[PDB]
Structures are given as C-alpha cells and as structure tokens.
Amino acid sequence: TPEETTAPIMTQGSLYNDSLSTNDFKSILLGSTPLDIAPDGAVFQLDRPLSIDYSLGTGDVDRAVYWHLKKFAGNAGTPAGWFRWGIWDNFNKTFTDGVAYYSDEQPRQILLPVGTVCTRVDSEN
Numbered sequence: 625t626p627e628e629t630t631a632p633i634m635t636q637g638s639l640y641n642d643s644l645s646t647n648d649f650k651s652i653l654l655g656s657t658p659l660d661i662a663p664d665g666a667v668f669q670l671d672r673p674l675s676i677d678y679s680l681g682t683g684d685v686d687r688a689v690y691w692h693l694k695k696f697a698g699n700a701g702t703p704a705g706w707f708r709w710g711i712w713d714n715f716n717k718t719f720t721d722g723v724a725y726y727s728d729e730q731p732r733q734i735l736l737p738v739g740t741v742c743t744r745v746d747s748e749n
Contacts, residue, residue, distance in 0.1 A: 632741050633658045633668075639736030646724035649693060649707035654736070664697040664705060667712060667719070667745040674709065674735065676725045690722040693742070714749045 697705025
C-alpha cells in the first residue's frame with residue numbers, strides 16, 4: 625500500500641485550444657507524469673480559472689467558470705482513464721461536470737500557460 629504526500633504539480637506543457645478536447649483533458653498530452661501516475665478518483669484544482677462562454681440556442685448568453693479537474697477511470701467503457709473538468713463543491717463534498725469550451729468567434733489563445741500550478745486534493749480542502 626504505497627503512500628504519497630500531497631505536493632504541487634507544475635505543468636510545463638502548454639495547452640492550445642486546437643489540442644484542447646471538448647470537455648476532456650489528457651495528462652500525457654501535457655506531459656504530466658505525476659497526473660498520469662496519480663490515483664484514480666484524484667481531484668485536482670487549477671490555480672488558473674477557466675472561463676467558458678457559450679450561447680444558448682434560446683438566445684441566452686451563459687457564462688461559467690471552472691477550476692476543478694477530476695480523473696475518471698476504472699470504467700468498463702473506459703480502457704484507461706480520462707480527465708474531465710467541472711466544479712468542485714468543497715462545502716457539499718460533491719462534484720458537478722462542466723460544459724464544453726467552444727470558440728466560434730473568439731480567437732485562439734493559450735489556455736494553459738507554462739507555470740500553472742495544480743494541487744492534488746485527496747480530502748476536504
């Protein structure tokens with residue numbers, strides 16, 4: 625039963641919108657070994673909030689901010705695992721998924737700059 629301490633994970637791999645999945649994240653893509661070897665079910669928080677703006681077909685404009693990343697694995701349909709962003713409710717100890725980021729008129733911009741620090745959360749913050 626291996627034990628590890630909580631330590632910050634820095635990401636040196638930039639992430640571009642063209643390489644950004646609709647709602648998934650890939651640790652291999654960012655070259656983050658620690659995230660890949662991180663325990664399944666691990667909850668990570670990004671110190672850099674991601675704002676996702678989208679337009680509803682009704683004509684309403686909705687804006688949302690996300691900073692929670694969770695790795696799901698151990699699923700029959702999931703061969704290994706995948707990361708998906710959402711909102712982590714520390715007070716309710718519940719997690720909520722998030723919408724996909726889509727830029728139609730917005731320009732391409734680096735969404736994950738080098739120097740971003742992620743923290744491993746394995747309990748209540």
